[model samples]
Target: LLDTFQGYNCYSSALGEYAKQKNIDQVENIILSQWSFFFDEEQFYKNQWYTGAADGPVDVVLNEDLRNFANIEVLEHISSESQAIDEGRKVLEKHGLQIVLMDFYYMNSFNWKSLSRFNVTREHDPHFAVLTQINENSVHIIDPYYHHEENMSMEDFIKSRNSMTKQGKISFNSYEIFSNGTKKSNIKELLYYRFNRYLQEKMFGKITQFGQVVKKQLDNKDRKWAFTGYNCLNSVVYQHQNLINLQKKFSLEMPPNLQELLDNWALIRKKLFEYYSRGSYNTEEISNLICKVASSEEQFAQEVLKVL
Candidate 1:
């Protein structure tokens, strides 16, 4: 939803409905915006939603019995070199089990990817896991290590994380880790992406500790579809609320583009906050409103990518 290519028609329908009647569609679009990564589609007539039937090859909804999927919880322990973590996970896979959460040992050197963090969420957390209800399709993984401000080499960071894994104290990046049966689902490649983009950039931003995710576990699992939708900016804002505060704390460039985006994001967040500000924020009513917002956002991201 942060960019453009994700949601297009979803927005058009909802916004049109919003202006016509308090069409529940607007509200549905609004809520859906939180996780446009999954719901947005292009070929409306060719998809199941148009046909009012569900059948398609998609990453969001799988063939699993996702109903009442809210009851499953995974508690895996990892200690010792990361290589061993993989070995342990392999055993879990062999047992017809998959990891939904991880506990990694504390460490200073961890190559947790910071860039392509969303990719991690989609690969796992199928049932409205953490950020679902509203922003269900968003990937919101955090690596807590803001203690050090200085940057380290990726090699060192990788070793540090591996050491933590060997020490039986490591939190995993994505919730699910399995051997993909297809060429596109390969686990090694997924880990490689996360290690480089998200898990590695520890020094550039504040790192939240494993304690945070564990403490804030609003544990939920909704079988057929897991929820995941969270804005990455929320990550940036969580630690650095204001650019001035960020600049004073660290000698960084005065990010004009960032400042502007944050401003606009504030507007979008405000409307969303007002909607969810009411308890029981679940319902397709306001979800469509979000869908519109997310569709525009995805389009914008695509536009930016093109310019780059």
Candidate 2:
């Protein structure tokens, strides 16, 4: 269950930590509400899987509107060498910014207990973890993956971070620095507004495009495409559930139209899941359901735009 929330969500998780450190409430809701789902045909064919919402898009959406609550600065490709680390430490200390979000390559040599189960050796496999403290002897890190918080000796910490630079993956050395603002804003409300705006402007079109492509493939009798379509559809249902869960968790009420859309989506998701689980293609039924849900989602987005 925790994995469901944290998997493929390192950057957002690190941001959540930053929000918490800055005393922002409902960090999870603030972050998750910006979640969007889209289907990439190229990615699906190339990697046999579709890409979810990337970190860059979400960052743009949140940071643009979040300036009142916090300011974010991203430093990319900082050197992990000893001299650079020493200089960076001095700068951080000089600025009195103790906690920062850093990206690193997940290496086997570090032997992180939380990550021991997986054989994580890719040079390009970047992971985000928060640097909570930098002490004389050790550096404290909070890894959102598997929810780990531990202190590592300065030597080991530098060694692990150097894995990215050593393997010629210079891009892994990026970090985000967050500074709180003086405004007394409702962080949660602001995020919700941004989320609704994001859904209306960005996600609605993607949902429509996905439905069209999936239906076209089905019409062309592409059975293999069914699996990919099913996966993308599953992501849609999951994204909706996340929003629904967020509202319930925060005791927030959705407008009548939005709630009606959610209720309709639930029924469609149930039927689709059952059919897919039983290995029933039923192209006509699946395609119709996809169209119905996509249309409903379009209406939902329109309603959301009105709210915004």
Best by TM-score: 2
Structural similarity to truth (TM-score) of each candidate: 0.23, 0.57
Give candidate 2's whole-model lDDT.
0.51
Q: Evaluated with lDDT, which candidate comes out highest?
A: 2
For candidate 1, write residues 107-189 as lDDT tens digits: 22223254332323212111111111111222222221221122334343333333333113333322332222312222223
Kindly report which residue stretches of model 1 are placed more than 4 angstroms away from their true locations once superposed.
1-261, 264-277, 280-289
Q: Which lDDT value does model 2 have at 47?
A: 33
lDDT of 1 at 238: 28
